[PDB]
Each structure stands twice: as structure tokens, then as C-alpha cells.
Symmetry: D2
Subunit: 237 residues, 4 copies
Amino acid sequence: ADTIVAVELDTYPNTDIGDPNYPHIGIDIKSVRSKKTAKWNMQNGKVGTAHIIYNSVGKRLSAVVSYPNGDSATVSYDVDLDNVLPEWVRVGLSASTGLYKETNTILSWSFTSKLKSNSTHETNALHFMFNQFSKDQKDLILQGDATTGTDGNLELTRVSSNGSPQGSSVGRALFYAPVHIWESSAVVASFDATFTFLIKSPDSHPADGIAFFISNIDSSIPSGSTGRLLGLFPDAN
Amino acid sequence: ADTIVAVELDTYPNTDIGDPNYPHIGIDIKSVRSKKTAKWNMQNGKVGTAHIIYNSVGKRLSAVVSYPNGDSATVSYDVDLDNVLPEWVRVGLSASTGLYKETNTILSWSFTSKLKSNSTHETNALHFMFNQFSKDQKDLILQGDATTGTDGNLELTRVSSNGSPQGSSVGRALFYAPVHIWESSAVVASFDATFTFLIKSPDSHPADGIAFFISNIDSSIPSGSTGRLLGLFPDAN
Amino acid sequence: ADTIVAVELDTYPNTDIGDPNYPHIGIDIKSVRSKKTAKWNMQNGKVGTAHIIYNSVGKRLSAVVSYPNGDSATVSYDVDLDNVLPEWVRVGLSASTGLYKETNTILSWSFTSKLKSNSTHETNALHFMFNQFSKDQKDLILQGDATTGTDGNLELTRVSSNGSPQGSSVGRALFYAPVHIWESSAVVASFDATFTFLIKSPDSHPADGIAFFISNIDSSIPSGSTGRLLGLFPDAN
Amino acid sequence: ADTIVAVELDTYPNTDIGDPNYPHIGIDIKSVRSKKTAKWNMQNGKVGTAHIIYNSVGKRLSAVVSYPNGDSATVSYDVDLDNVLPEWVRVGLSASTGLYKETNTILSWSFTSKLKSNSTHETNALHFMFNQFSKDQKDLILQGDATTGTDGNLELTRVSSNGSPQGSSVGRALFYAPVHIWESSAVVASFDATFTFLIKSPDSHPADGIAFFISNIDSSIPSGSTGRLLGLFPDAN
Ligand SMILES: CO[C@@H]1O[C@H](CO)[C@@H](O)[C@H](O)[C@@H]1O
Ligand SMILES: CO[C@@H]1O[C@H](CO)[C@@H](O)[C@H](O)[C@@H]1O
Ligand SMILES: CO[C@@H]1O[C@H](CO)[C@@H](O)[C@H](O)[C@@H]1O
Ligand SMILES: CO[C@@H]1O[C@H](CO)[C@@H](O)[C@H](O)[C@@H]1O
Ligand SMILES: [Ca+2]
Ligand SMILES: [Ca+2]
Ligand SMILES: [Ca+2]
Ligand SMILES: [Ca+2]
Ligand SMILES: [Mn+2]
Ligand SMILES: [Mn+2]
Ligand SMILES: [Mn+2]
Ligand SMILES: [Mn+2]
């Protein structure tokens, strides 16, 4: 299977697979069963912002999700990603719907990675920022139901022409270049990511969420990973 | 044929095909015959730095090459790259040797592209920085004789096991991700590139040069573009 | 007097001092009499974005102002700022009102300066970005009627508590740190700036405009520089 | 008294005042007695690199010091800097010598601060990078014996005309602009700092160390804070 690290914005409490019984943000290390969660007031129809930060020194993977009204949820988990992730990875966004649904609309997405060697000034870095997604976004690998160009937005899951979300959808966007996320010789490996999203559901309850993830370079949507699996895992192990 | 925009650090006067009779910096718009050149005193065995700068507002492509003792060569050329390059590109480094040779050693390579649209705050950006090239450097596409990892460097052309450069070599390094170099709705598209290089010819009779280039995404080294053609062009037209 | 370089967003045609007879963008080199202007459709009440770019290689100072509807005005002027500006400078925004008025509201402001030496990797850089201005913005020197903290915005000129603009107002905001804008030894000196603004007038015609400027470090509003003088010059010489 | 948060590269064990009995890296929260230290093998006459990293989400301040041969020391400490520093600060470098001495030579110094608020896209940022310090370097506040310009470096403490360091020296370099280190409404405040240093003791008996610090804006060198007090603290409490 793929190797996944993710920060999940999980809109739907799947308590059968260990979700807490509320919308929550979570840190997923090789399992959908968040090593750590925090309660999250997902505000239906509002533009939210997620920030993900890690460095190899502190070895603490941190995430915050906030809305303009100031409500914010945070989660941090101590993890040495050198021991989790392959040295080269891709990074992406993933979202799903199930039986319940929501738009999983990405308005913007940036990422910075840094690999600082002992050698003096010898930082390697990758940064990208998408504030506008075009129809044919060639630096983005779109997977599953992921489309771009739709209000300048990335729709990770299916939406109808009227902006109505479809259920049992999964989709992801990976940045095209492999990312060197750690290196033997590196003093500091550090990455941060930000994305802004608009999760809107006409249902009883929104589902299933958005995740920022780091995978093996050849990572693909696991079959069946709609719903609670968030486009990330083949199962709930 | 590929579409190439390049800045050439041309170490070998091929007067035969329109080079000036001295080592020079040149701007190459779809031809190895520079639209503009400037005399360049290549310092054998020294680390030089080339900067390349363009924005879509000023519509001037500028390049400078310097060495630590302060000596520098500059060339700039008015061109609207929107009329030249496709909307998506790859950017890269190329080098060649021919009858004569030199180390085409790249010690560092950074690049920033920005696309600032109309919509308000909607910059797309890419930036990468390589101060250290690794043996297997998955965000570079290595072409021809280009290799990475030998002293943390990118050797664009063949160097024998003892640091001794080889004739009739060509190699290139393209950043893996396509680059949105322009867009109709962008207010500003800008890019700048820096690389540091070590050109050493054991005889001080160097050939043929290094180039920063921008090409069609599927650019490959044209057949028999060693020597004066710098791995960029199929001929000297 | 101060030494001023500015990009003006000039909302009011003062043809007595050489303004073209329309709103225009302009490049001001030590005079309010733009060395170069372009017609500008200032859209009353809309959020506009100005981008200013220069580098020391191309020696072309470029500016674009755009609105979300895609209307954009550009101006570029060849100028070697090494010959204009002191080596250390401050950078800022300025705006004025006269007999006519407008809000001169700055929503955001960023600036990057870069000073790259021959010495290898030896960039100096300053970057700042204000997307939110607070009441007591200590990295900003506010001059004249300039206030911050008002919707998270910088109001360069007087506005009443109901957001109504006042005439015969001038104000500016300078970034606190001196900026090293050029250096003998530098291979590349380059700066860019962006700001977003909301110019709204209830009058017949808006006045007088917003400028991004670079001055001597001790620069202050010239007395009387409300109105067409834009907070920049003591007169129209 | 000033409020100091610092990372110390402490070259001289003052066991007397709680140093461990070896050269060490330390995190100093309002006291020269580090909350956390780590053993540091200072390499006489080599260029070392220190990285300091904090974000307000993870609430862990981490520092690493390395030398080109790969050897490195790391310390991290959970602290919420919002409860420690004022909202606005200056950031700087400090060094001292005492009975014993060393070059406290800074070759480069960069810093990034970000304040990411609630409002959507509303990052405030500051970044500066000094790879070259100039004789009159108007964006640094030089305090005590600190000087700039000698080999393009910042000598934090006195060095005789022949490169020979002096005892009982103190000096500091603060970036000129106040830094918005935190804000109540910010979702994320983060900062990171890097500097490269050359500590040379002709005898290999070095004292006293270099620190990266964050202080009240009006921080000055406390009286008799040469030696073990690193120009940071008025006493060793
Ligand atoms: C209750 O059934 C589920 O619906 C929720 C919301 O979609 C998902 O968590 C899950 O995987 C199924 O598809
Ligand atoms: C003399 O033949 C050439 O050698 C020079 C010097 O390398 C090149 O410019 C060229 O294309 C051929 O390979
Ligand atoms: C017509 O009088 C003027 O009003 C316009 C608009 O304010 C300004 O250009 C000028 O300086 C005076 O104050
Ligand atoms: C022995 O006296 C001290 O010298 C050492 C070594 O420099 C310092 O730590 C200290 O504060 C005094 O100056
Ligand atoms: Ca779930
Ligand atoms: Ca040639
Ligand atoms: Ca005017
Ligand atoms: Ca000590
Ligand atoms: Mn979950
Ligand atoms: Mn040529
Ligand atoms: Mn004018
Ligand atoms: Mn100590």
C-alpha cells in the first residue's frame, strides 16, 4: 500500500473506525485512525484555512484550521517523519464524500519544503502556491474526481454544474514534482502547507472531509477510499 | 522542433555561426544565434554565478554573470515571452562540450516563477532551490550525459573519474514540474533564475558553455546538439 | 529636499503640472512630473492591485495596476536607480486628497528587496508583507494623516468614522527598516512591491491618488504636499 | 529588565551558574540558565550554522547547530512564547567574551517571521537575509562592541586589527524593525532564524558564546553582561 502522512479535516464522525464523535482535525500516520485529533467546528459554507507545519528538529507535526470568525482547532503530534515517510514523496490534497456529501473545494494551496544540509548555505527548497487553479493545471496531478478551472478552484470531489456536491466521490491533487522531505545528511527538514477550502453540504450532515497528505511518489487513490477513508487509505487499519 | 528561450554562457566562439569572437553571454530566442550578446571573461576554474530575470511588465529579459573578484557581463533583450514560449514550460540547465571541453559543473540552481492574476491576491508561484544535488534527485529530469551527486553537484556533461571533462558531451537538467510561464489573464508573469557554475578546462581552452533554458514541457536534447548547439537546438539556424 | 522615486496611481488630472488629462499611473523620478505615464481606469470603489518591479540589470522600472475585472494599466521607464536614489532608502506608500477626495485605503502591501553580490550566494534581502494592519503597527512609520487598525487597513488619508474621505489630507506609511536598494559591488539589485487599494470617492471626481515610493531614509511629508503633490514633492518642478 | 528569549551557543562552561560542564546549545527563557541544553562540540575555527525554529501551533522552540563535517547539537523546548515575549520584539544576535575569548564572527544571518491571522489570506510577514554585512548597515542596530564590514562580516565582539579576538567584549546586532512576534487574533505565529558563525580561539580555549535573541524592542546590552551573560542578562539568576 502507499505510505501516507496526512492532516485530516474530517467532517464526519465515523466512530466505527475510531473517529471521535464530532468533526475533527487529525494527524494520520499510516492509518486513518488519527494518532491525534482535536474537535473542529467545521462551518458549513464558510471559507476555512488549514496550516500544517513540521520540522525535523522539533519533530512535531502541527496543524491548525481556522475560519474568519476566529474559531480555530489545533492538533500536534510528535513524530519523526524520517522514520515514516520515504525520502522522496509527493504532496497533495485529498477529499471524499460518501453517503453524506459536501463540496471539497480548494481555493488556494501552498507548500514550502526545506532541506538544509550541514555543508553551509546548502538549503534545498521547493515552494509552490496555487491561488488560482486553471482548467489544465499541468503542475498538478489530478486523481479520481478531482477537477480544476471551476471558479479558478480545485474541486477535489464531484460537484454538479449548479455547484451541488455528489456523494461517493473521491479526488486528489498532487503536486507534480517529487519532494525531498528528508535526507540522511540534513540538519533541518521542514515543510509547511496551507490550504483554503470551502466545505458546503446541503445534507443533514457534511461528509467526509479534506486532507493534506504526503505519500510515496507513485501514490494513487486506494480503490474504495471514498467516504470515511478520505481518499487516503485502502481500509481503516 | 522544441521551442527554446535561453541564456547562454557561451565559452567558445563559433564565429562560423554568428558567435562574437570571444566568450560571451547571450540571449537565445528560438535560435543558437543570440539576439543579443555581451563579452564574457570566463574565469577558468572559478565559481561563477549567473542571474536571469524577466517580467511580463517590463518585457525585458536580462542576464548577468559574475565571478567573486567582481568582474561581470550583462545582457538584456526586449522580448515578450508570451509571443515566444508556450503557456506551460519546463526550465532547465543545459551544457555541452565538443572538440573542446570543460567541466559544466553546476553547484546550485534556483528558480522563481510567479503568475499574478487579476482576481486580487491570486499569485501562483513556483520556486525551487538546489544547493545540493543528490545521486537520485527525483525533481530533476536528467537528460544526455547530465548526472547528480558527485560532490553534491550537477555535472551537465561527462567528467572522467578524476574530475577531467570529456569532449562531445551533452546534458541537461530540467525541473520536474511544468511551469506556468504565462497566462492571458495574468497581470504579471515573472521569473528569475540563478545558478552557480564551475567551468574548468585543464588547458584553459574551454568549450562549449552552459545555458539556462525554458522549453516546451517535452523538450529533449536535439540530435547532435553537442558542441556549439549547447544541447538546445537541432542546428545553428 | 528628499529624493523620491515613486510609482503614482494618480486619480486626478492636474494638467497645470503636466499630468495627462485622465487618471494615470506614472513613474516619478525626483519630480511629480512623471517621466512616463499610462492611462488608468481607476474604478471607483473597487479593490485594485499595483505591482512595481525593478532590477538593476534590466534597469527598467515597471508598474502595473489592475482591477478584478481584468482592466490593467502598465508603465515602464528605463532608469538606473543607482544614479537616482541614495544607497539606503526607506520605502513607503503615500496618498493625498485635495479639493477633491477619495479614500486611500491600503488593504495590503508587500515588498521584497534583493542585493546580490559577486561573492557567491551572498544575497541580502528584505521582504515584508502586510495583509492586515493593526492599530499600533510598529514596523510602520506613519506620517501625516496615515492611520492603521481601521478594518485591518491602512488609511493613508483621513476618513471619518462612517468611512467618508476628507479633503486636503496627506499621509504615508514607511517601512521601518532602512532598505539597501543598491551597492557598488552588487551584481543584482532588484525590488518589487505590491499593494492593494480601495480608492472610493463620493465626489464628482476622485483625487488625488496613491504612490509607492522610495526615498531617503529621513524622508517626511513635504509641507503643503496634499492634493496633486501626492505627499511626495514640495512642488511640481 | 529586558525580556529575553534566546538560543545560546555557549562555548564556556560556567558550572558556577548552572551551565553543564561542556560547551552547549541552550534555550534561554528570561534567564541565562537554560531551560534545556544539549552538548555541543564547538569546532574551533570552523564555520558553524545555527537554526532556530518556533511556531505558535506546536509551541516548541527548537535549535540546531552544525558544522560542515555533519556533527550537530539540538535542543528543543516546549514553551508558549505568547506568555513570555511582548507582542512586539526585536530580534538579534549577541555575543560576549570574558577572561577568555573567541571571534564571535557572524558571516550570515536570516530571519523569517509570519503572523497568520483568521481573516483568510492575511499573513503578515518579515524576512531578512544578511550574507554580507556592510560598514554602515542601516537596518542593523549595533550595540556594544558589535561592528560590520570587516570581511563582509558582523564581528559581535572586538577583534584586534590582526583577527585576534579580545576578552571582556560584548556586542549585539538587532534588526532595525520591530517584529510582530505574536498577536491574539493570529492563528499561527512562526519564526525561524539561521546564522552562520566563525568562533576561533587562537588557544582553543574559547569564551563565551553567541546567542540568537528576541527581546523588548528597546532592549540594550545590560550592564556588565560580558562573559557568561552573553550580552543578554543583567545577572545569572
Ligand atoms: C454512513 O455511511 C458513510 O457515509 C459517511 C458520510 O459519507 C462516510 O463516513 C462513510 O464512508 C460512508 O460512505
Ligand atoms: C571544431 O568542432 C566543434 O568543437 C567545438 C568546440 O567544442 C564546438 O563548438 C562544435 O559544435 C564541434 O563539436
Ligand atoms: C483643483 O484643485 C486641486 O484639487 C485637486 C483634487 O484635489 C488636486 O489635484 C490639487 O492639488 C488641489 O488640492
Ligand atoms: C573567569 O571570569 C569570567 O570569564 C569567563 C570566560 O570568559 C566568563 O564566562 C565570565 O563572566 C567572566 O568574564
Ligand atoms: Ca470521518
Ligand atoms: Ca559557441
Ligand atoms: Ca494628479
Ligand atoms: Ca557559559
Ligand atoms: Mn477522523
Ligand atoms: Mn554564442
Ligand atoms: Mn500624475
Ligand atoms: Mn549556558
